[PDB]
Amino acid sequence: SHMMKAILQLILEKRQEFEKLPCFEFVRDETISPEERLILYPCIAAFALNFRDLNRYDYRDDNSSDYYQKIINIHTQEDAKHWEWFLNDLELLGFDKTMRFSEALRFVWSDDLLHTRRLCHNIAVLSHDLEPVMKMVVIEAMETAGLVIFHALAKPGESIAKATRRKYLYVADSHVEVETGHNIITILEQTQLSSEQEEKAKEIVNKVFQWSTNLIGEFERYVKAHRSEKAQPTAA
Amino acid sequence: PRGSHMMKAILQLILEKRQEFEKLPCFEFVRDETISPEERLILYPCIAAFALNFRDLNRYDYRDDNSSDYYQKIINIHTQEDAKHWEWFLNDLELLGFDKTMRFSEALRFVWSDDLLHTRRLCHNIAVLSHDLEPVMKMVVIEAMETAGLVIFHALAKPGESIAKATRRKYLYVADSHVEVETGHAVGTENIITILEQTQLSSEQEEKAKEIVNKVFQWSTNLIGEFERYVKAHRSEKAQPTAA
Ligand SMILES: N[C@@H](Cc1c[nH]c2c(Br)cc(Br)cc12)C(=O)O
Ligand SMILES: N[C@@H](Cc1c[nH]c2c(Br)cc(Br)cc12)C(=O)O
Ligand SMILES: [Fe+3]
Ligand SMILES: [Fe+3]
Ligand SMILES: [Fe+3]
Ligand SMILES: [Fe+3]
Ligand SMILES: [Fe+3]
């Protein structure tokens, strides 16, 4: 059992199962119009800005002298910028519609977006008392699940971007390329964990992908319940 | 000291923090009847970053319907009442003229504004603090949170009831009825403070209880500071209630 080969293999095993979820088969289906495949886009509003705060305030610790924490801090500086990309594509896709303040509040805190809204909350609770090397396991599992989601979402996104000649930033290949280079993974490959640390790392990987699966399930149920609320992008 | 005396100190510490919390300048502003009540409730939209997070805190973080600990069952009952008040907030939001029409992204940018950081993360910090606590320690979190909340809504009810009387409208969040519900407890349930009064704490429990009380009131103080800075930065965005 060399080093953290078992933990990294567990992440790869969870990733292959996560990739086969029915919501991703729907998003990758080029026989369906990309505007209908991005019906789930407004659901990300309950996550994208919570993810910003997760990287700003929960992962990050600008006062610590730990070298592993400083590498985490640099990693969070990049991920904390992507919320503006979400709001950019929100307007481009025609989902930045006008509404009452309370209607926006009821949408974000809707019971149908519970798992989406509480994903970053659960991650922060899990990672509050972890040592920096254990925080990296949380981040690495989170980055792996996110790359799966945006590798699929970029397919209808780039189709709309090309057809409308607009520059998309969130559901786009440029977002995927930044996430692909997400070094934390090099430290994990060279880190030896104790028996207690390895058991905790397995729990981390299981919880992250279980919570991510719950979020994807909410995305699929939203598409079924809002099958007519397709994206409405404009051409340039 | 004695286990009953170590707990007595914690409950006295909550009262000591409450007396200091009551003297914050934001509360002197809200209680000043020489200032228009519409201007004293300028801070009301700031509560949008808290009220619905507080609902989820009571729904999912405090509550645990699978445990057989009777203290946990009393916590669950207590959270069922507090988890209903978010609808009162949205009720008064519309009455005060703060439920304005806007872009979806503009509502998102408001809730996650950096000027509402401490307001938005208060329930988050409470949930992180209360995740691994035993039920009796969770009651200390709840009791401190309820004490700080009562201070805030005792003050907010003064301009709220003035507007309710002048406009003949039924307010539910910034109203005396909200304060009375928080002061009273559910029928047939045992008071949380009474259970705490009869609880003997260990030396380790007293150390955690002091940290809990200090953190809850410090985070509440940070939220109030954001409310005061918001009023100064948005002095013209007064409430606009309508009459009957
Ligand atoms: N690239 C994502 C980060 C991310 C990381 N993990 C994610 C999961 Br699981 C679901 C969703 Br929706 C997003 C993510 C972002 O910038 O918001
Ligand atoms: N009675 C409040 C609960 C509450 C409890 N503690 C609070 C603090 Br500290 C700040 C604010 Br704003 C609200 C609260 C409510 O129903 O939302
Ligand atoms: Fe990203
Ligand atoms: Fe990333
Ligand atoms: Fe309340
Ligand atoms: Fe209460
Ligand atoms: Fe109470």
- What are the residue ranges spanned by the domains of chain A? 5-31+40-225
Q: How many CA atoms lie within 13 A of A79 on its CB side?
A: 28
| CA–CA distance, B4 with A157 (Å, rounded to integer) | 63
Provide the sign of the torsion angle of the four alpha carbons A110, A112, A115, A119, taken in this order.
negative
Topology given in CATH for the domain delimited by B3-233: Heme Oxygenase; Chain A (1.20.910)
Rounded CA separation A23/A15 (Å) = 14
First-last CA distance in chain A? 56
Check CB contact of A108 with chain B, cutoff 8 Å. Answer: yes
Pocket test for ligand 2, best of B22, B52, B54 (most atoms within 8 A of CB): B54
CB atoms inside a 10 Å sphere around CB A210: 13
Of A150, A129, A168, the residue nearest A212 (C-alpha): A150
Which residues surround the ion ligand 4 when the cut-off is CB under 5 Å?
Answer: A 79, 143, 179, 182
Which structure tokens are listed for A26?
């729907």
Structure tokens at A215: 């979020």
Coil, helix or strand for B202? coil
Distance CA A49, CA A62 (A): 20
- Count other Cβ atoms within 10 Å, centred on residue B218: 14
d(C-alpha A136, C-alpha A124), whole Å: 13
Distance CA A219, CA B39 (A): 42
Which amino acid, one-letter code, is at A218? E
CA-closest candidate to residue A103, choices B101, B1, B241: B101
What SS3 state is found at B2? coil
Nearest CA residue ID for atom 16, ligand 2: B85
Smallest CA–CA distance, residue A2 to chain B, in Å, is: 33
Nearest CA to B22 among B152, B156, B178? B152
Q: Any known ligand binding at B112? A: no
- Binding-site residues, ligand 1, Cβ < 6 A: A 44, 47-48, 51, 79, 82, 142, 145-146, 149-150, 179, 212, 215
Q: Atom 5 (ligand 2): residue with closest C-alpha?
A: B149
Please answer whether residues A213 and A20 qualify as being in contact, where contact means their C-beta atoms are separated by less than 8 angstroms. no
Q: Are B86 and B14 in contact (CB under 8 A)?
A: no
**B49, amino acid identity:** A
For residue B193, the cross-strand partners are: none
- What is the distance of C-alpha B41 from the center of its chain? 16
Taking alpha carbons only, the member of B35, B228, B56 closest to residue A50 is B56
Q: Which of B45, B104, B112 sits opposite A97 (nearest CB)?
A: B104
3-state helix, strand, coil in chain B (%, to 5): 70, 0, 30
Distance CA A227, CA B13 (A): 55
**Coil, strand, or helix at residue B71?**
helix
User: How far is residue A18's CA from residue A217's CA, in Å, rounded to a whole number?
Assistant: 11
A204 contacts A144 by C-beta, under 8 angstroms: no
Question: Measured between alpha carbons, how far is A65 from A33 in angstroms, rounded to an integer?
Answer: 50
Residue type, A153: L
CB atoms within 10 A of CB A201: 27
For residue B101, give the 3-state DSSP assignment: strand
User: Which residue, chain included where needed, has tokens 């567990």?
Assistant: A10
Residue A38 neighbours by CB under 8 Å, 6+ apart:
A93, A153, A156, A157, A160, A171, A230, A231
CA-CA distance, B152 to B59, in Å (whole number)? Answer: 22
Chain breaks in chain A (C to N over 2.5 A) after: 182
d(CA B124, CA B118): 10
Do B102 and A97 make contact, defined as CB atoms within 8 angstroms? no
Resolution in A: 2.0
Partners of residue B102 on adjacent β-strands: A99
**DSSP 3-state of B27:** helix
Measured CA to CA, the distance from residue B204 to residue B192 in angstroms comes to: 21
Residue type at B1 in one-letter notation:
P
Q: Is A128 helix (H, G, I), strand (E, B) or coil?
A: coil
In the chain, the amino acid numbered B6 is: M
Q: What is the CATH number of domain A5-31+40-225?
A: 1.20.910
Q: Whose CA is nearest to atom 8 of ligand 2?
A: B149
Residue closest via CA to ligand 1's atom 2 equals A146
Ligand 2 site: residues with CB under 6 angstroms?
A: B 47, 50-51, 54, 85, 145, 148-149, 152-153, 182, 220, 223
Interface of B with A in 26-65 (CB under 8 A): 45, 48, 52, 55-56, 60
B50 CA to chain A: closest CA distance, Å?
Answer: 11
Could you give the CA distance from residue A210 to residue A203 in angstroms, rounded to a whole number?
10
Largest Cα span, chain B: 59
Helix (H), strand (E) at residue B53:
helix B48-56
